[PDB]
Design a protein around this nucleic acid. Structure first.
Length: 76
RNA sequence: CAAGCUUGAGUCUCGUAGAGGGGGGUAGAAUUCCAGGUGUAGCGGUGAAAUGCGUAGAGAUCUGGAGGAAUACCGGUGGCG
């Protein structure tokens, strides 16, 4: 569920996937953070144990809200 | 029982103070909500937490608007009934 995002990420390099599924390739964490920032989105570590770790560009708050919404609705 | 009397009780005149009652207007503070600008990962809550709220961008800040309810200071063994 919970993913670490943005500056919480410690990986030197990550494989980057953008908000639409475009495979941006291997990028330094710094460049990945720049791309996320220019798009006003977050850099989310979706696959911490992949080699190299996989990050997805997305709105973390919107993603998390929808996930919690889904869980709650299906149980009431 | 009858006539009275003016001190009890009323009436008259002119003023005074008052959150006394009923109706109608209207005001500025705040909360919550709606619409936006800035901003970004927390806010909120407790003894400690969690539920809750926030990347569909909250909270914080600035702006405009809606609505309801109550009227800080004055304010006080103050006042009115």
């Amino acid at each position: 569920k919970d993913f670490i995002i943005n500056e919480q990420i410690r990986a030197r390099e990550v494989r980057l996937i953008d908000q639409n599924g475009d495979q941006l390739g291997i990028k330094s964490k710094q460049e990945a953070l720049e791309i996320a920032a220019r798009r006003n989105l977050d850099l989310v570590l979706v696959a911490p144990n992949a080699k190299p770790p996989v990050c997805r560009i997305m709105d973390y708050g919107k993603f998390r809200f929808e996930q919690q919404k889904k869980e709650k609705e299906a149980r009431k």
